[model samples]
Target: GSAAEVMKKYCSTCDISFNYVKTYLAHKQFYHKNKP
Candidate 1:
């Protein structure tokens, strides 16, 4: 995926609807348990 791309998605780890790649990338990679 592209960092510049808008996420508008969620955090499967904590069930949080996020809208930024940085947040998702950081949250997931560091604690999400699964990073795609």
Candidate 2:
């Protein structure tokens, strides 16, 4: 999924630690908050 890819890429690009679940949760929250 895009969310998974985005999270993976973001973590790699930023050289930061992250979890898939956390990324999914953040993506969900972001969509919910920015829904058009």
Give one digit per residue, the lDDT tens place, for model 1 in 1-36.
347954456764477865776776677677755655
Residue 19 alpha-carbon offset, candidate 1, angstroms: 2.8
Query: Per-residue lDDT for 1-36 in model 2, tens only?
Result: 363545441334335453676774565556445773
Indicate which candidate wins on lDDT: 1
In model 1, which regions exceed 4 Å deviation? 1-8, 33-36
Model 2's alpha-carbon lDDT is 0.50
Error of 1 at 10 (Å): 0.8
- For candidate 1, report its TM-score: 0.42
How many clashes (backbone N, Cα, C below 3 Å) per candidate? 0, 0
Ten contiguous residues with the weakest lDDT in model 1: 5-14
